[PDB]
Amino acid sequence: GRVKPKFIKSLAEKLLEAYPDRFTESFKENKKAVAELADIPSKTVRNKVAGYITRLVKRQKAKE
Amino acid sequence: WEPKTALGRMVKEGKIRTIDEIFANNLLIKEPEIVDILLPGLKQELLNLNLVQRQTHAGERNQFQAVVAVGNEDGYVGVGIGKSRQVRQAIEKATREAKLNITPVRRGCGSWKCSCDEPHSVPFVVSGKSGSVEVTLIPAPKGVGLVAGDVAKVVLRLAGIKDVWTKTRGDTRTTLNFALAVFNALRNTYYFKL
Amino acid sequence: AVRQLMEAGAKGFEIVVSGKLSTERAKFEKITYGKLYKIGYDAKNRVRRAVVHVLLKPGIYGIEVRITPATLRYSDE
Amino acid sequence: IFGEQLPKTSRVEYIGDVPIIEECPRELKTLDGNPILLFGKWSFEDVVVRDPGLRRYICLKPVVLPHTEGRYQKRRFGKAHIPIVERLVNLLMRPGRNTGKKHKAYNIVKRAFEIIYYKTGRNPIQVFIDAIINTAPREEITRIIMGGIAYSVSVDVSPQRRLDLSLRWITEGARQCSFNNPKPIEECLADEIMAAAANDPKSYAVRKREELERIAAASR
RNA sequence: CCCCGGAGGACCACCAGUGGCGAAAGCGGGCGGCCAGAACGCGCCCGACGGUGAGGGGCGAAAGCCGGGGGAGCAAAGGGGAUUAGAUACCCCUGUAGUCCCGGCCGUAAACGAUGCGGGCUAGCUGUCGGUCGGGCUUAGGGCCCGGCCGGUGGCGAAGGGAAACCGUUAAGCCCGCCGCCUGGGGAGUACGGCCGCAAGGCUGAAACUUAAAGGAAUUGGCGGGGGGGCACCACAAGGGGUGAAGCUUGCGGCUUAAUUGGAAAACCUCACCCGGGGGAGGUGCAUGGCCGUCGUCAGCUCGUGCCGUGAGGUGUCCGGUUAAGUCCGGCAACGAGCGAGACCCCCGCCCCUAGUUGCUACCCCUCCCUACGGGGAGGGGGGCACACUAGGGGGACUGCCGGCGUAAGCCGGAGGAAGGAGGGGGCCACGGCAGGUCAGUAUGCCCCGAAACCCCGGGGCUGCACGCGAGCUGCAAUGGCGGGGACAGCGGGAUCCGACCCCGAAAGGGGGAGGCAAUCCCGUAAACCCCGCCCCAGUAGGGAUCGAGGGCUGCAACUCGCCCUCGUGAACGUGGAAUCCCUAGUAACCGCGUGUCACCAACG
Numbered sequence A: 001g002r003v004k005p006k007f008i009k010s011l012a013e014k015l016l017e018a019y020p021d022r023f024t025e026s027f028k029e030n031k032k033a034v035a036e037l038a039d040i041p042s043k044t045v046r047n048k049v050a051g052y053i054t055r056l057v058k059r060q061k062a063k064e
Numbered sequence B: 001w002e003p004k005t006a007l008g009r010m011v012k013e014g015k016i017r018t019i020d021e022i023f024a025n026n027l028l029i030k031e032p033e034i035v036d037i038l039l040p041g042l043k044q045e046l047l048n049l050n051l052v053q054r055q056t057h058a059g060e061r062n063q064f065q066a067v068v069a070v071g072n073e074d075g076y077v078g079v080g081i082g083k084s085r086q087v088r089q090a091i092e093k094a095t096r097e098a099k100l101n102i103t104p105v106r107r108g109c110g111s112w113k114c115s116c117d118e119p120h121s122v123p124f125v126v127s128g129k130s131g132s133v134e135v136t137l138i139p140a141p142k143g144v145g146l147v148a149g150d151v152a153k154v155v156l157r158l159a160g161i162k163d164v165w166t167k168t169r170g171d172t173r174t175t176l177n178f179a180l181a182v183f184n185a186l187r188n189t190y191y192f193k194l
Numbered sequence C: 001a002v003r004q005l006m007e008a009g010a011k012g013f014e015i016v017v018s019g020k021l022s023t024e025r026a027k028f029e030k031i032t033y034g035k036l037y038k039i040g041y042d043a044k045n046r047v048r049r050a051v052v053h054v055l056l057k058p059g060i061y062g063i064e065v066r067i068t069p070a071t072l073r074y075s076d077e
Numbered sequence D: 001i002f003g004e005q006l007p008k009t010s011r012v013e014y015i016g017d018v019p020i021i022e023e024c025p026r027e028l029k030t031l032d033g034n035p036i037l038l039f040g041k042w043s044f045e046d047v048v049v050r051d052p053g054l055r056r057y058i059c060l061k062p063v064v065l066p067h068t069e070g071r072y073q074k075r076r077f078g079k080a081h082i083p084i085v086e087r088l089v090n091l092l093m094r095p096g097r098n099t100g101k102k103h104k105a106y107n108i109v110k111r112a113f114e115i116i117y118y119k120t121g122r123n124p125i126q127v128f129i130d131a132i133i134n135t136a137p138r139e140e141i142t143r144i145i146m147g148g149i150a151y152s153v154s155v156d157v158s159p160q161r162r163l164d165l166s167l168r169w170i171t172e173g174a175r176q177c178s179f180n181n182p183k184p185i186e187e188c189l190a191d192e193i194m195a196a197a198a199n200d201p202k203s204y205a206v207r208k209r210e211e212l213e214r215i216a217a218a219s220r
Numbered sequence E: 001c002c003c004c005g006g007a008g009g010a011c012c013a014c015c016a017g018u019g020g021c022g023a024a025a026g027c028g029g030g031c032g033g034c035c036a037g038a039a040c041g042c043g044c045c046c047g048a049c050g051g052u053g054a055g056g057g058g059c060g061a062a063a064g065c066c067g068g069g070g071g072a073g074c075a076a077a078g079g080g081g082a083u084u085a086g087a088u089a090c091c092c093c094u095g096u097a098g099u100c101c102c103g104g105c106c107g108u109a110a111a112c113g114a115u116g117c118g119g120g121c122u123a124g125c126u127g128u129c130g131g132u133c134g135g136g137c138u139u140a141g142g143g144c145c146c147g148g149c150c151g152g153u154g155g156c157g158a159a160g161g162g163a164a165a166c167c168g169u170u171a172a173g174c175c176c177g178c179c180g181c182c183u184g185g186g187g188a189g190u191a192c193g194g195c196c197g198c199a200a201g202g203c204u205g206a207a208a209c210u211u212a213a214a215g216g217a218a219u220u221g222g223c224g225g226g227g228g229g230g231c232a233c234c235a236c237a238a239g240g241g242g243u244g245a246a247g248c249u250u251g252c253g254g255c256u257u258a259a260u261u262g263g264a265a266a267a268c269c270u271c272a273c274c275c276g277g278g279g280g281a282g283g284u285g286c287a288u289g290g291c292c293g294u295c296g297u298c299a300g301c302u303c304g305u306g307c308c309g310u311g312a313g314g315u316g317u318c319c320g321g322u323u324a325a326g327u328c329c330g331g332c333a334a335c336g337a338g339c340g341a342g343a344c345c346c347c348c349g350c351c352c353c354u355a356g357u358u359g360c361u362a363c364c365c366c367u368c369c370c371u372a373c374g375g376g377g378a379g380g381g382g383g384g385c386a387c388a389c390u391a392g393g394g395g396g397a398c399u400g401c402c403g404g405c406g407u408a409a410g411c412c413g414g415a416g417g418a419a420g421g422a423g424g425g426g427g428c429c430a431c432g433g434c435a436g437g438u439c440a441g442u443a444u445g446c447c448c449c450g451a452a453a454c455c456c457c458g459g460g461g462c463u464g465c466a467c468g469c470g471a472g473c474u475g476c477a478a479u480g481g482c483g484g485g486g487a488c489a490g491c492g493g494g495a496u497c498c499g500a501c502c503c504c505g506a507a508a509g510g511g512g513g514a515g516g517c518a519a520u521c522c523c524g525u526a527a528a529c530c531c532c533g534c535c536c537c538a539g540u541a542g543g544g545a546u547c548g549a550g551g552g553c554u555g556c557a558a559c560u561c562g563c564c565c566u567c568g569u570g571a572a573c574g575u576g577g578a579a580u581c582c583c584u585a586g587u588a589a590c591c592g593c594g595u596g597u598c599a600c601c602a603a604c605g
Ligand SMILES: [Mg+2]
Pocket: D180, E477, E537, E574
């Protein structure tokens, strides 16, 4: 994966902000939560969204 | 309709019921819906329609440039321009900009060959200019009529003027500039320090 | 014949009339809408496409219509 | 000098300050501690590469038959893992009527190794390594334009390129010597490798490297 | 080239500036003399004595002219050496007027701020020059810094003005005077007349006739032998294989011809052409629809609202990092959104589940064979779905982790991992173009042929051959040829078709015929490759063109003009000029097999 397009980051931010407490800095839990929480009929886009939420959780813990 | 912009909220809530109050208190109209609410008797006319082209590698990409004059025939007029790929939305854009740019026009007598105190003509000598078309509007006696060009006659009639004398300079064949200069003079009736 | 389409809640349509509509030189007049997929899966497989030619005075005058109704939620959400 | 870590299967042999590097594990044996013999006959143990830069790219890892499947070309510098004898085999698949005939190339190399051992009394692998060391060019010339005339200018050759040039020169010399005459390709390759090892100027590889180096010294 | 001396002509490097002076032309070393004109300071003198100015004048670059002097450097003209198709130019060597000084003439210039001269009013901010005043300091100086006024000289920029560029207290603004000039272009700064000049020439300056524009500023594009950035095996670099030369297959051109057909898997038919006889495959793809190819191994295009503009139009969509991407991240009069990108759809690759009329064989028993005597191998049957396979669904990989870098988009290395950076192959083909190709696929406007186009027949032609060009096959050999021997796939196709097996035949081929309407039967034990023997550098045991004799296959028909086999015959060719093509991994290359066209025939896909 080189660069995440607009809809990837948009879905990432909306799912991260609607439910800020259902995501932490692991990929497996992130994939499980996004599969539980969003209508994601594509494994690749789901995996990309989970990884991108993982990176937001990393940066949000890093900022404090 | 949703009264976007707070002036539209008051206008739909009926706290402002007449269009005169906006121009009396210097209120800026940002939406056309206030205009159609406060002036249901608004007539719009298509003053000019020119085809306009841009050169590109595959050929010219044409766009219609439609000029629209809106008026209530009672001292309220506005003119707007719309460029669009098709004539219908070009006219729609021009109508919307005319409705946004509507303004009151001061009327009266003032001709030396007349004495009636009616709004049939312009109150004093006024001027307008758009690019190089200069149009001087002069008060006239009642019954003379509109002594301007055709598009100028349309704009003046929409603004609610019966008789006037015109003096023009520059290429009036530029229909957009002629219409804009006439509308500019009608709006410059309000810049006179009474 | 487009307010008939706005009667439906279609998120996408595309109408092309190809021929000598005004002169003896063809022009390919075309109008379109917004959220209407053009290539890939829906277009060419799950977007209602219809091509018909009508014998007018001087030609067949092709008409191509691509439509997607208000419930064609392709894989983007 | 490095700050990017290193892949495993590599080995560092720090002498003084210089970090000598080998990409292939020399120390390999069977489960019982026995050695692995090239072609079942020649040992990989006593072979010594005298060039420090060339030591990094000659894979002297013990293998019975030098046959990697063509799987080390995806990554840059992947050729350092290919065994040197298999590189010799791979540079025998030309011209175009011999492409893919790895069994023929393997048979040619095996016969040449037997001939080398019986004519020199030395390890065939050692003689081939010495031929590569005597054949590898240490200088090169590169194109340059001064306004329309493509001149030359001396440059250095990276050790990978030196190894590739020496191998190509040896194989093409053998092929040219074998074409259109009764001499067999195995004997041509054997004499070419032995002349390269002895640094005899008759050999195609030594002539080619000398010509290239003199051109580089001329157009510095 | 260096040194020591002398002579001569020009110029006045740095300092040096949108710096100064002057009406303009113009003026750049120092000292001195003689003049001129401004600015500043002033409770100095006169008292409107002023502005502009037709006519009339005087000054006025360079080149040039007249006479005299001078001549270093440069240098029209000229000479020579090069370059080029030419080179009477551009480059080099040389060279005379001229350039310099004195007296005079000339009186022109993009002589320009393309902006006449005089006066008043109209926000400002900022560099610099001269004078002067207030304060501070002092290289104690005629110095420096800050602030005010007056007067110059630049920059940005109120109001205002303008077609716009732009001007904007140095106006192109708002006004008050006077002078000069303009009235579409070409004809034409031409002709005639006059005046001036030594001359060159100069000043002044038409019409006939001809024409519908010439022209200004700005916008989009296109282009550039201007600049910058990005990218690409339909580019290069590093490589591999080649094509271009020979023989042969084939396509176009040309020539020939009754015709060799018309465009851009051929004997009949096809077929449209020619000879003979009994509704358009006729045109215009510049009338068109549809389809398709290429721009496009792109990333582009647009919209809503706002903003700048009189407008065509800008902005967003621009800048920096980023990459496949108009992909993002961060700054901006932009803020959002949409089609294209992606996502998405098939197939390959690892694991899991479900499944075993078909497919798999671990486990068994019956038989045959061998037996170094332990055991082994082969076949049938049973058992089973273990393995493998088959097919439907799911999981898995996401820059996920670590080290580094970065505001952050994201990039590099490493591990682990079936699979690591879009995992690999392909599909879907944006807006608009290419007056792209297709009325010979169907369709259709118009215009034609009109019992004539008919997919009528018989024969021929498309197969004619001096030659040119494009794509191919097989070779020149020894990493080879030949002859034996041993193998090892995967698609795919099969109905009157695939065809096991059997018999005949030296081969091609012939006769009978199981099974299979499909994981069941068949095509089907592929070639390269490995092994063994013969050949030994030669136009040959390389090569297989050409030709002779003969035997078959398909078909209504085989000569023009088919395909296969036997025996004989053994040409060019010894690795191919200029040039040129493709290709980054299970890829290139080599090898064969299936299949499309197909009664037969593939050097093609
Ligand atoms: Mg030979």
